[PDB]
């Protein structure tokens, strides 16, 4: 589905900042140009632009999140969070299915806005129950937005708190992404230094850091494995995470993607519930075959392949669908996509012969 021409015009009308994004669960895409926002249904052939230009300052992040229960009328399916350099703005959204292809979409103002504060917002994630978490490229702190139905004299309808609190003595480090796992009430952050932090939503408004695992720990774990490799060193970056839900696995909590194309599967255990320890257990090394125009003529562990070097972006979806954006050239991306060999996995016997085919 080609990007509609009316936003290509707006994109080139940009002065300082533009950004694109996806709302795949309702079939909408979006583009921000400075202090303006535009949504459209990409399944539609001649889409109408749903614009929101009330924003005064440059938009830095937008996300589509479930609403908090008992706050809005039932016809509101989602909440649209719009972060600018000045404010975090909440909008009501109804994506009801009128009537043929995608969900007809309407925006509602809420009179809910918080000062952005000193910390940039580039990453917005939401939970099943409508909790909204924020993070960005100023630091590693995680913020949460509360919002309420009532006007109270002592509180406000809309608030923002910092769940991290650092003291003095700081070091430069910021976030690369935020990741929710509702089945375990966990939140994961990934930093630019490839540090993985795990937070537990112990209570309905509480968030608690329970694990911090830096690259060094991952590398020590990796060293104690029978097979070390040049594809994972202290020079290597972790570019993406993908949580694994509790319904898919008990032990393996998280997958981490290196820029050399290695998938690291990390377990996490309680000492007894939130986890307190995280460990690199299993590595899936890259495939060897590179893409070709002409077909080519087709048992030891291959731990040196560079077919996925460099991996810029990475996504994992249950039950193991893997997408890797390989940026071999500065101009065109190649897409590596794999799935579990379900057939061979269920045929394999006995249990000890099972490999990640």
């Amino acid at each position: 589905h080609n990007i509609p021409d009316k936003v290509f015009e707006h994109l080139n009308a940009g002065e300082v900042f533009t950004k694109l994004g996806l709302f795949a669960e309702i079939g909408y895409a979006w583009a921000s140009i400075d202090s303006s926002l535009f949504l459209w249904d990409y399944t539609h052939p001649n889409p109408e632009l749903i614009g929101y230009e009330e924003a005064t300052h440059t938009i830095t992040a937008v996300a589509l999140v479930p609403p908090k229960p008992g706050v809005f009328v039932k016809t509101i399916t989602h909440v649209l969070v719009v972060a600018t350099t000045s404010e975090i703005i909440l909008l009501g959204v109804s994506a009801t299915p009128t009537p043929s292809g995608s969900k007809s979409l309407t925006l509602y103002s809420t009179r809910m806005s918080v000062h952005r504060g000193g910390s940039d917002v580039s990453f917005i994630v939401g939970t099943k129950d409508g909790r909204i978490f924020l993070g960005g490229e100023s630091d590693t702190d995680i913020h949460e937005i509360f919002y309420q139905q009532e006007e109270r004299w002592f509180s406000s309808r809309c608030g923002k708190i910092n769940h991290s609190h650092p003291f003095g003595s700081r070091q430069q480090e910021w976030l690369r992404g935020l990741y929710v796992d509702d089945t375990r009430n966990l939140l994961y952050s990934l930093s630019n230094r490839s540090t993985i932090r795990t937070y537990h939503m112990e209570g309905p408004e509480k968030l608690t850091k329970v694990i911090e695992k830096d690259k060094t720990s991952c590398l020590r774990d990796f060293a104690h494995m029978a097979d070390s490799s040049p594809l994972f060193t202290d020079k290597t970056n972790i570019v993406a995470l993908s949580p694994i839900p509790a319904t898919e696995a008990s032990k393996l909590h998280l997958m981490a993607l290196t820029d050399t194309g290695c998938r690291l599967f990390l377990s996490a255990t309680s000492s007894a519930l939130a986890p307190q320890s995280m460990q690199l257990q299993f590595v899936k090394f890259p495939p060897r075959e590179s893409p070709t125009r002409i077909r080519t003529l087709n048992s030891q562990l291959d731990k040196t392949s560079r077919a996925l070097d460099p991996s810029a972006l990475g996504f994992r979806f249950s039950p193991g669908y893997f997408f890797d954006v390989v940026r071999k050239h500065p101009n065109q991306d190649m897409l590596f996509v794999s799935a579990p060999d379900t057939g061979r996995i269920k045929v394999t016997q006995p249990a000890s012969a099972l490999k990640y085919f």
Partner: peptide, 14 residues
Amino acid sequence: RKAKLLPMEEALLP
């Protein structure tokens, strides 16, 4: 076309 923003009154109950 600027999207029509329906009011808060409809949005949040009760």
